[PDB]
Amino acid sequence: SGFRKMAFPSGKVEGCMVQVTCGTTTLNGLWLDDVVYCPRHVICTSEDMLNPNYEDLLIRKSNHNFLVQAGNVQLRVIGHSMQNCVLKLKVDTANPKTPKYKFVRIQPGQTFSVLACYNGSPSGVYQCAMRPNFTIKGSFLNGSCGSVGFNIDYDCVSFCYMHHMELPTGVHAGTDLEGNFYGPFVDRQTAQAAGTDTTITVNVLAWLYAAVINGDRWFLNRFTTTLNDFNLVAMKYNYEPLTQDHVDILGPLSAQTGIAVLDMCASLKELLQNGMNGRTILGSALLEDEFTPFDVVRQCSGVT
Amino acid sequence: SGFRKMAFPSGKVEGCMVQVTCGTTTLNGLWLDDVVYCPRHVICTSEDMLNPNYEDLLIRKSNHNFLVQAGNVQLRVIGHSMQNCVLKLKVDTANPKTPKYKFVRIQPGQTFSVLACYNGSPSGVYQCAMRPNFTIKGSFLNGSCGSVGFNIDYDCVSFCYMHHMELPTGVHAGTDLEGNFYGPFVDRQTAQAAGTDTTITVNVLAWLYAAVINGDRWFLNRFTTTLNDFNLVAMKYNYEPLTQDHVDILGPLSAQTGIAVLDMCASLKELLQNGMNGRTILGSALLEDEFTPFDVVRQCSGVT
Numbered sequence: 047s048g049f050r051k052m053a054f055p056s057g058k059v060e061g062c063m064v065q066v067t068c069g070t071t072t073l074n075g076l077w078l079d080d081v082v083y084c085p086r087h088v089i090c091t092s093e094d095m096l097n098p099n100y101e102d103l104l105i106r107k108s109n110h111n112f113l114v115q116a117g118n119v120q121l122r123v124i125g126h127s128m129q130n131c132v133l134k135l136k137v138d139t140a141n142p143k144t145p146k147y148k149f150v151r152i153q154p155g156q157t158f159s160v161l162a163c164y165n166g167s168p169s170g171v172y173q174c175a176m177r178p179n180f181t182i183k184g185s186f187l188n189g190s191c192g193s194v195g196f197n198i199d200y201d202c203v204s205f206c207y208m209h210h211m212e213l214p215t216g217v218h219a220g221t222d223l224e225g226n227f228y229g230p231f232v233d234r235q236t237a238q239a240a241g242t243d244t245t246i247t248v249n250v251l252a253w254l255y256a257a258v259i260n261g262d263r264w265f266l267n268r269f270t271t272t273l274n275d276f277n278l279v280a281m282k283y284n285y286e287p288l289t290q291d292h293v294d295i296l297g298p299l300s301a302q303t304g305i306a307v308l309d310m311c312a313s314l315k316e317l318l319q320n321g322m323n324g325r326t327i328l329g330s331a332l333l334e335d336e337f338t339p340f341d342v343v344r345q346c347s348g349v350t
Numbered sequence: 351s352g353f354r355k356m357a358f359p360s361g362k363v364e365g366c367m368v369q370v371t372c373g374t375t376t377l378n379g380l381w382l383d384d385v386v387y388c389p390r391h392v393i394c395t396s397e398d399m400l401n402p403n404y405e406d407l408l409i410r411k412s413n414h415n416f417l418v419q420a421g422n423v424q425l426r427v428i429g430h431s432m433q434n435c436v437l438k439l440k441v442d443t444a445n446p447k448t449p450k451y452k453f454v455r456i457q458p459g460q461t462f463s464v465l466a467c468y469n470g471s472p473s474g475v476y477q478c479a480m481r482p483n484f485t486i487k488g489s490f491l492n493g494s495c496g497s498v499g500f501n502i503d504y505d506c507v508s509f510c511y512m513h514h515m516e517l518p519t520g521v522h523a524g525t526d527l528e529g530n531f532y533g534p535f536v537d538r539q540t541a542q543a544a545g546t547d548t549t550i551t552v553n554v555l556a557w558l559y560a561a562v563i564n565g566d567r568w569f570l571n572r573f574t575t576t577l578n579d580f581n582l583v584a585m586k587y588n589y590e591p592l593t594q595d596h597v598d599i600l601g602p603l604s605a606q607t608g609i610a611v612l613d614m615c616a617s618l619k620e621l622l623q624n625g626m627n628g629r630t631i632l633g634s635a636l637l638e639d640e641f642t643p644f645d646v647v648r649q650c651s652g653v654t
């Protein structure tokens with residue numbers, strides 16, 4: 047029993063972290079086979095970041111300008127290219143610790159683990175979600191860029207995030223490993239505001255299932271609702287509209303608990319309308335929305 | 351910017367996890383040099399657990415009864431001994447992935463990372479604290495026992511916890527790596543109730559410093575207090591009495607923020623007396639007490 051915000055074991059990703067330096071800028075790269083992936087803003091001076099022309103900045107950079115270091119051993123760069131907002135540095139050595147891996151572009155509401163690194167060295171691991179506004183709520187200081195977000199399916203690491211940006215509101219923006227930003231964000235120091243941080247309804251419901259499974263049940267009530275009635279309440283409280291797809295995804299948690307998805311919706315409806323009244327659910331005083339239905343099943347069943 | 355419940359990178363510990371089976375019971379062992387550490391209740395039938403005599407149960411066990419498996423390779427057991435509530439299984443092979451390590455018995459209020467494992471395979475990593483009642487609030491299913499808690503100082507893993515027990519209230523009890531339980535808990539299926547779960551005052555104050563550092567400042571007020579006045583309020587709300595040692599430990603966060611420890615105490619006092627009034631601090635609706643002052647400095651400065 048017990049339910050905790052859990053990250054994937056970071057070992058397979060730790061073995062892929064290197065340091066990349068172009069001139070005076072140091073950040074993290076991801077070393078997979080004979081390619082090191084890193085944010086293209088490694089080629090910028092802070093000056094450049096107001097309105098950088100990356101193609102033009104890149105022309106001034108040669109292979110030998112990209113200093114790549116795995117622990118205390120230097121990698122030889124034999125090629126470099128820009129793909130969207132990332133650089134791919136071809137090195138002469140395949141990373142011997144390359145795990146089985148995929149690159150996946152995740153949907154908003156999907157969760158992943160971040161290995162926060164500085165100078166290619168891991169500092170820690172935490173769980174994130176891609177927010178509906180395509181920000182993530184991270185812990186990233188100067189030097190953390192190139193830190194990656196990932197899921198693990200048994201032995202295969204699916205890399206979904208590379209850290210690039212902090213918005214003036216202290217939320218985080220970045221790319222998939224093909225260098226395409228999540229949402230409308232750009233690697234430029236400009237006016238970029240996050241849109242509404244909407245709550246991931248399907249994740250809250252999953253987490254309410256996790257609570258019932260782990261003995262926290264005070265918020266169960268005698269009510270039910272409909273998708274359309276619940277969605278009137280979702281709208282008011284800036285929650286994602288709940289769809290039949292979301293209902294279908296909650297099926298297995300429904301089955302195991304014997305609580306109909308729409309009855310749990312009626313519990314969430316009452317919690318939205320009445321608050322927690324100073325009570326807690328799985329050690330939280332607000333409605334947690336960074337566990338997926340998959341995350342709840344995984345943790346509640348002890349998958350490895 | 352941003353502040354997250356962060357675990358240590360788990361790689362160094364992942365390389366130490368094995369599976370231990372005695373008869374029908376499978377749990378996790380920790381493989382360091384040529385010794386595998388595991389809970390002694392691996393020798394029990396569920397029947398035994400009502401009132402086990404471990405010395406007498408152990409007499410029936412030989413080296414060859416302890417099946418130790420690192421991934422898909424079997425380790426040869428050449429000796430076994432009971433130290434308090436753990437077994438030490440001597441194997442003929444030093445773990446080649448043994449990191450630099452120490453065993454440390456932590457004090458209540460100290461934090462650590464747990465690598466949750468099942469059948470010697472890592473499922474995930476989360477941050478815990480040793481609670482003042484010597485429980486931890488974990489995520490542990492059947493098969494998770496032998497999962498360990500640890501801190502990392504640069505390259506040295508300090509193992510502080512091995513998971514042994516769930517109390518009927520769904521909180522967790524276990525041992526240091528010398529097999530001594532934290533608190534009054536025993537590896538017997540009996541009436542064991544946790545005492546008062548008191549809030550770690552010094553950790554809450556640290557986390558209030560983390561909030562100010564990361565821009566959450568609405569709870570700062572025009573008041574100060576004294577240790578004795580604050581402690582009257584701590585008593586009422588089941589918070590640990592704040593000591594000059596705690597004040598001294600908060601010194602560096604005091605220095606960096608320019609907020610006197612006792613002024614922050616007055617903010618915490620008002621939050622205890624008036625609640626959050628539906629507001630949040632670093633994404634929380636309650637007062638977080640599982641970050642140490644050390645944890646805040648570490649995360650806020652990007653140590654690796």
Ligand SMILES: *CC(=O)N1CCN(S(=O)(=O)c2cc(C)ccc2C)CC1
Nearest residue numbers: 071087090091092188189190191210
């Ligand atoms: C995330 C991360 O490590 N970084 C992104 C933000 N920069 S920066 O904008 O401070 C910067 C400074 C300098 C001197 C050159 C280039 C950049 C982007 C730090 C790195």
Ligand SMILES: *CC(=O)N1CCN(S(=O)(=O)c2cc(C)ccc2C)CC1
Nearest residue numbers: 375391394395396492493494495514
């Ligand atoms: C934490 C963990 O993995 N375990 C502790 C609790 N036991 S048990 O009490 O269910 C048990 C069952 C059997 C059949 C033998 C011995 C024990 C302790 C499961 C393991």
